[PDB]
Amino acid sequence: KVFGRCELAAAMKRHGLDNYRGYSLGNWVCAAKFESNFNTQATNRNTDGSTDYGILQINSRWWCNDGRTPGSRNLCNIPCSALLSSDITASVNCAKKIVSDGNGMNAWVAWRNRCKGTDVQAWIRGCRL
């Protein structure tokens, strides 16, 4: 499913991401925009053989099981395909573990290079929340 900006903002809010670990909602929407263009079915393979999945492009090296990433962890305890659903619950649940890992939102490279330090509130402008 391809989310609209405000529709995703509302879903993330509903799932308790607004201000999660001190990160305002605009940060999460900005990260989803640049990581997957708001497409829950996005996948990208990395050089190390791991793959990034879903709206928040969560990596198979540590967070989900895809059965093809030799000696990887599954810290979220889910099959990576769960991250591609139209229902963002699994993606959100996993994102909360990642952001609590010590590096905050820096774990998402697109957040760090394209969102961090920008007016992220622009991502939720005009939405009914």
| DSSP states of 50-77 | -EEETTTTEETTTT-B-S-STT---TT-
Is 7 catalytic? The answer is no
| Amino acid at the residue 119 | D
SS3 (DSSP) at 79:
strand
Q: Show contacts of 76-79: CB within 8 Å, 24+ apart.
A: none
Technique employed here was: X-ray
From 18, 35, 66, 87, the catalytic residue: 35
User: In which region does residue 97 sit, left (phi positive, over 0), alpha (psi from -120 to 50) or beta (all else)?
Assistant: alpha
Whether residue 101 is annotated as binding a ligand: the answer is: yes
Crossing angle of the two packed helices 25-36 and 5-14, in degrees rounded to 10:
130
Tell me how far apart the alpha carbons of residues 126 and 124 are, in angstroms, rounded to a whole number: 6
Catalytic residue chosen out of the listed positions 7, 18, 52, 87: 52
52 is catalytic: yes
Q: Judge whether 126 and 4 are in contact, CB under 8 Å.
A: no
Of 100, 111, 128, 103, which is closest to residue 9 (Cα–Cα)? 128
**Residue in this structure with the two tokens 């997957």, named with its chain if needed:** 36
Q: What angle do CA 11, 126, 18 make, to 5 degrees?
A: 40
Measured over the CA atoms of residue 9, residue 10, residue 15 and residue 20, the dihedral's sign is positive
Per-residue tokens: 31:
């990260």
Whether 56 and 108 have beta carbons less than 8 Å apart is answered as yes
Distance CA 7, CA 120 (A): 16
Task: Specify burial of residue 125 (Cβ count, 10 A radius: 0-12, 13-18, 19+).
Answer: exposed
User: What residue ranges do the domains of the chain occupy?
Assistant: 1-129
Q: How far apart are the first and last CA of the chain?
A: 21
Q: Rounded to the nearest 5°, which phi and psi values hold at 44?
A: -150, 135
What is 1-129's CATH number?
1.10.530.10
